[PDB]
C-alpha cells in the first residue's frame, strides 16, 4: 500500500505521540524551535535581484549556503561558529586551474577560561573567534549564557549553560562558597538569565537523555492491591458514614 503520511511526517507523529507528548512543554518548545547559526564562511547575496538566463530580465534571487562540517569535537569544545569545510578547490582561485581535493581547517586550539558562576577555570577546545566573542560578551559566563545553542555550537557549552542556568535559578550557595556576599554579586551580575528551575534542568539535554529522564520521572513502583483496596474500602465506608 501507500503510507498516509510521508516518511518525514513519521518523525513528527512520533514527537506528537507517546512519552514525547508528556515531555515538559518548556523543553518541547526548545527542541521544536530552530534558530539558524550565525553565518561565518559564507555570505547571503547582498542584492535581491539578478538577470534570469532564459528571459534575460531581472529576477528574484536565491542563496546557496556553503557546506560546512562541524565535527563532534566542537560539541565537546567551545567553537565560535568555525567549522571544517570539506570539498573541492580550484588552485590559484581560477577556474582554468586544476581541481584539487581540499579540506579547509580553521585554526583549532585548547585554552582555559574562567567562569565566575562556576568559580572554576575550564580548559577546553576553542577557536580565536570564540575568544573575541567572550570579550564582546563581557565575560566567559556571559558568552555561554548569551550565545544560543546553534551559535554556541557546543554540547559542552550548552551543558555549561545548563549548569550556569540552574545555578542562577536556584541561588545555590555552591556559587563562590564561603563568600555569600560575592555570591549575590554574581547572581545579580548574571540576574538576566535567572529562569525557573524546571526549565534550566532540561536545557541542552539530548533527545535520548530527555526520553530516559521523562521515563524515570514517570516510572512508579507497582501499587500493592491490598493498599489500593484499603483506600477504596475506606472511601466507600467513609461515604457510607456520611
Nearest to 104 by CA among 121, 122, 87: 87
Among RNA, other proteins, none, what binds residue 90 when CB lies within 5 to 8 Å by partner kind? Answer: none
Question: Is residue 8 close enough to count as binding RNA by CB under 7 A?
Answer: no
Query: Positive or negative CA dihedral for 214, 215, 221, 223?
Result: positive
Question: Is residue 84 close enough to count as binding RNA by CB under 7 A?
Answer: no
Q: Which of 39, 48, 52, 173 binds RNA (CB under 7 A)?
A: 52
Question: Is residue 98 close enough to count as binding other proteins by CB under 8 A?
Answer: no
Nearest to 214 by CA among 2, 31, 6: 31
Between β-strands 109-115 and 85-90, what pairing exists: parallel, antiparallel or unpaired? Answer: unpaired
Radius of gyration of the chain (CA): 26
DSSP state at residue 54 = T
Question: Is residue 54 close enough to count as binding RNA by CB under 7 A?
Answer: yes
Question: Is residue 5 close enough to count as binding other proteins by CB under 8 A?
Answer: yes
Minimum gap (Å) between residue 141 Cβ and other proteins: 40
Minimum gap (Å) between residue 36 Cβ and other proteins: 20
Question: Is residue 59 close enough to count as binding RNA by CB under 7 A?
Answer: yes
Gap between the Cα atoms of 82 and 129, Å rounded:
8
Question: Is residue 13 close enough to count as binding RNA by CB under 7 A?
Answer: yes
Question: Is residue 22 close enough to count as binding other proteins by CB under 8 A?
Answer: no
Question: CA 128 from chain center: how many Å?
Answer: 21
Our CB check for RNA shows the closer of 57 and 110 to be 57
Minimum gap (Å) between residue 20 Cβ and other proteins: 16
Question: Is residue 4 close enough to count as binding RNA by CB under 7 A?
Answer: yes
**Binding residues for RNA, total number by CB under 7 A:** 16
Query: How many alpha carbons lie under 13 Å from residue 145 in its C-beta half-sphere?
Result: 26
The window from 3-11, 31-39, 172-180, 187-195 that contacts other proteins (CB under 8 A) reads 3-11
Query: Positive or negative CA dihedral for 204, 209, 213, 214?
Result: positive
Burial-class residue 204 by CB neighbours within 10 Å (0-12, 13-18, 19+). Answer: buried
Question: Is residue 18 close enough to count as binding RNA by CB under 7 A?
Answer: yes
Question: What is the binding site for RNA (CB under 7 A)?
Answer: 1-5, 10, 13, 17-18, 52-55, 57, 59-60
Amino acid at each position: 500500500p501507500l503510507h498516509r503520511y510521508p516518511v518525514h511526517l513519521w518523525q513528527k507523529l512520533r514527537l506528537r505521540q507517546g512519552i514525547c507528548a508528556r515531555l515538559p512543554a518548556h523543553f518541547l518548545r526548545s527542541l521544536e524551535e530552530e534558530r539558524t547559526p550565525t553565518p561565518v564562511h559564507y555570505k547571503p547575496h547582498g542584492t535581491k535581484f539578478k538577470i534570469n538566463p532564459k528571459n534575460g530580465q531581472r529576477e528574484r534571487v536565491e542563496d546557496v549556503p556553503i557546506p560546512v562540517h562541524y565535527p563532534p569535537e566542537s560539541q565537546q569544545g567551545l567553537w565560535g561558529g568555525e567549522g571544517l569545510i570539506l570539498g573541492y578547490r580550484y588552485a590559484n582561485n581560477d577556474k582554468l586551474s586544476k581541481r584539487v581535493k581540499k579540506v579547509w581547517k580553521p585554526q583549532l586550539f585548547t585554552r582555559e577560561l574562567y567562569s565566575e558562576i562556576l568559580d572554576k577555570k575550564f580548559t577546553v577546545t576553542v577557536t580565536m573567534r570564540t575568544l573575541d566573542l567572550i570579550d564582546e560578551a563581557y565575560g566567559f559566563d556571559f558568552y555561554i549564557l548569551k550565545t544560543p545553542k546553534e551559535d554556541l555550537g557546543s554540547k559542552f557549552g550548552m551543558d555549561l549553560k545548563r549548569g550556569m542556568l540552574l545555578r542562577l535559578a536556584r541561588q545555590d550557595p555552591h556559587l563562590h562558597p564561603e563568600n555569600p556576599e560575592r555570591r549575590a554579586a554574581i547572581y545579580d551580575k548574571y540576574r538576566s538569565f535567572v529562569i525557573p528551575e524546571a526549565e534550566a534542568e532540561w536545557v541542552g539535554l539530548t533527545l535520548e537523555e530527555a526520553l530516559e529522564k521523562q521515563r524515570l520521572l514517570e516510572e512508579k513502583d507497582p501499587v500493592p492491591l491490598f493498599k489500593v483496596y484499603v483506600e477504596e474500602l475506606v472511601q466507600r465506608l467513609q461515604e457510607q458514614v456520611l
